[model samples]
Target: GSSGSSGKVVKFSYMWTINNFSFCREEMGEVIKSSTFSSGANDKLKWCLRVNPKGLDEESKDYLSLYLLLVSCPKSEVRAKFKFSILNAKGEETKAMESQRAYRFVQGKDWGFKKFIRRDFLLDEANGLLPDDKLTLFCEVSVVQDSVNISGQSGPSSG
Candidate 1:
């Protein structure tokens, strides 16, 4: 499913599977990105999930980092609430995190947890986070169409 528009709040879920989990973990700073997706058919806006195998910075080195990036927004600001989770072999959400509230997004902007989960906990065999050397990630996005009107004021921000 994809996010909706036309006076309705739309929700969509995207799943990404990382093959060779061990190899991905070993490549610190390397990013594994999911394919681009749009809020809805003919929405013109594009989005994708981003994963930093190790972490984004030294502060989060021991943890996993995940983010949702706004790829292309041809018009007004887009607001969305997103959740990230690790799916176990049982097809259950083992670890889940979400935004407290909707966030306004512009092209190229990202929003998510810098420390999504501990790497050690995920790497442990008993956690079942990695099944058959594959890691599955789930992301859910809810796009909200706001009614607030910001008078049409063209600025230098337009590219």
Candidate 2:
């Protein structure tokens, strides 16, 4: 989606994968295995995030931008609002925040996938995110009746 703030328009695209039955159970097993890996670093290789500044307005200053893409399974559904925030090294939320309305999935018609793109201003006035500071992104998913399985893939940085 696109947003206009501070005299600039920002757009973010998010792609999320909601796995099917087999994939969900399989990945769930992996999650358990990796969490118990002998080495602590195995879990770190699971996912990554890649953001490109090309779509950002050139005039825009320091802002922490995020794009959230979500997908849902066939019989299952997601029914909780999503919030994105930037956290500092101390695990404190810095700046840049956005929330979404609760979303529901259609039965067979809406089974496979869906995407959400979100943008938030990440500056001192908003979240106080600084370029030199380490920032982390957090996503919370709430499922209805049956559990909704979700996974994300982050790409390499675009210079």
Best-fitting candidate, scored by lDDT? 1
Worst 10 residues of 1 by lDDT: 145-154
Reference-based TM-score, model 2? 0.34
Clashes of each: 1, 3
Off by over 4 Å in 1: 1-7, 25-27, 39-42, 146-159
| TM-score on alpha carbons, each prediction | 0.80, 0.34
Candidate 2 C-alpha lDDT tens digits along 1-159: 235432321122222222121122321112111111111233221112222222233332122223333322334443433355455434565443445454553322221111222223432334433343323454433333333333668786789
- Tell me the whole-model lDDT of each prediction, alpha carbons only: 0.80, 0.31
Superposing every Cα of model 2 onto the true structure, what RMSD results? Answer: 18.7
Weakest ten-residue segment in model 2 by summed lDDT: 28-37
**What is the C-alpha lDDT profile of model 1 across 29-114, one tens digit per residue?**
66677887754575677788888877888889889888888878877688889899999887799879875688888888888888
Task: Report how far off residue 124 is in candidate 2 (Å).
Answer: 8.7
Q: Which residue pairs show backbone clashes in model 1?
A: 4-10
